Amino acid sequence: SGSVSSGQAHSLASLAKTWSGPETEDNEGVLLTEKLKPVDYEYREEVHWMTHQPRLGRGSFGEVHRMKDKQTGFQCAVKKVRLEVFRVEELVACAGLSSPRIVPLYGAVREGPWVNIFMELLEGGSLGQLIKQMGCLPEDRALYYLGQALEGLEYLHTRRILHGDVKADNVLLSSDGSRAALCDFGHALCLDYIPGTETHMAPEVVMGKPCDAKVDIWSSCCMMLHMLNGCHPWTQYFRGPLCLKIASEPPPIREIPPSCAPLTAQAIQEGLRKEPVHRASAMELRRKVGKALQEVGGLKSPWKGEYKEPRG
Numbered sequence: 178s179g180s181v182s183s184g185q186a187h188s189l190a191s192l193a194k195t196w197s198g199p200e201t202e203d204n205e206g207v208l209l210t211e212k213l214k215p216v217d218y219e220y221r222e223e224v225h226w227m228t229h230q231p232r233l234g235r236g237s238f239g240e241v242h243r244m245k246d247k248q249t250g251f252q253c254a255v256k257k258v259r260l261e262v263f264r265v266e267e268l269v270a271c272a273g274l275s276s277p278r279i280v281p282l283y284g285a286v287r288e289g290p291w292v293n294i295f296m297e298l299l300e301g302g303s304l305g306q307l308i309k310q311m312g313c314l315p316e317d318r319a320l321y322y323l324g325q326a327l328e329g330l331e332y333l334h335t336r337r338i339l340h341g342d343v344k345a346d347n348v349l350l351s352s353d354g355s356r357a358a359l360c361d362f363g364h365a366l367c368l369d370y371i372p373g374t375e376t377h378m379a380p381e382v383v384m385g386k387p388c389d390a391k392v393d394i395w396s397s398c399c400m401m402l403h404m405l406n407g408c409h410p411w412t413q414y415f416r417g418p419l420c421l422k423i424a425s426e427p428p429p430i431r432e433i434p435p436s437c438a439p440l441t442a443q444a445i446q447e448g449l450r451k452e453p454v455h456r457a458s459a460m461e462l463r464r465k466v467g468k469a470l471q472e473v474g475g476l477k478s479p480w481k482g483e484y485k486e487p488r489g
């Protein structure tokens with residue numbers, strides 16, 4: 178027996194707060210959708226639910242899988258995280274939030290030293306998977322996705338929530354690739370910041386200065402460069418510890434493809450100002466990116482079909 182129940186977001190957050198020696202079989206948590214059903218107040222892997230197929234990808238602090246509720250047959254995603262590296266922020270930051278640009282959480286359930294976080298599965302795959310498959314993305318589609326990402330950031334930032342690791346691997350697409358949404362709040366902060374992916378990290382992060390929402394903007398423009406070039410910024414120019422190069426080198430605007438139109442290059446420049454004070458906000462950048470997309474003639478490229486050679 179255990180303490181897994183059906184309820185709302187706030188009841189999950191409250192319990193998650195208590196998660197922060199020996200290894201137990203303690204089973205407890207909150208399922209947020211009727212599609213995931215506790216059985217006699219239990220929800221245990223291999224008994225009531227199971228993972229299958231290959232991994233979906235890497236999440237913060239744990240692996241992500243396809244899973245199925247054995248009773249309802251309902252399919253979703255699960256990130257399994259060891260209790261000692263589980264951050265509460267992942268289940269508190271988005272409680273009471275709802276946006277088309279944010280992948281909804283289905284709940285979380287602890288099973289001894291493991292915390293299983295359940296989330297909607299979008300069948301388009303991740304933006305990171307799109308890049309790998311296609312080499313890189315054309316300018317219009319990259320702008321379109323950045324726009325959508327930035328809309329997600331507006332929604333977060335006005336609530337003083339920092340996503341903390343905005344990157345293609347944490348953006349999910351819909352089945353026709355027309356919709357992108359943010360996921361994985363493992364590094365989220367409610368405005369001590371646990372830094373995300375090194376290649377996407379702002380100078381103020383490596384400098385150890387107080388971080389604000391502008392960290393997400395920098396990261397999102399690093400993601401933009403990744404979509405355009407097919408690789409994370411820095412990696413094609415620099416060898417090892419990117420920490421110091423982010424802090425000391427000019428911002429990676431040299432990595433903007435020469436083919437990009439004026440306003441595309443401008444937006445990326447403004448999203449990549451070294452001093453957060455001069456860096457564009459999500460509201461500002463979203464507007465510029467919107468103008469930028471119009472000026473290249475709107476979204477025209479099909480989401481797949483043409484492999485584009487990345488930067489050598």
Ligand SMILES: Oc1ccc(F)cc1Nc1nc(-c2ccncc2)cs1
Pocket residue numbers: 233234235236237241254255256267294295296298299302303346347349360361362363
């Ligand atoms: O923080 C989480 C909480 C619950 C989850 F089920 C997943 C995540 N994290 C991530 N999921 C993905 C992903 C999902 C589905 N397909 C491709 C990638 C990338 S990072």
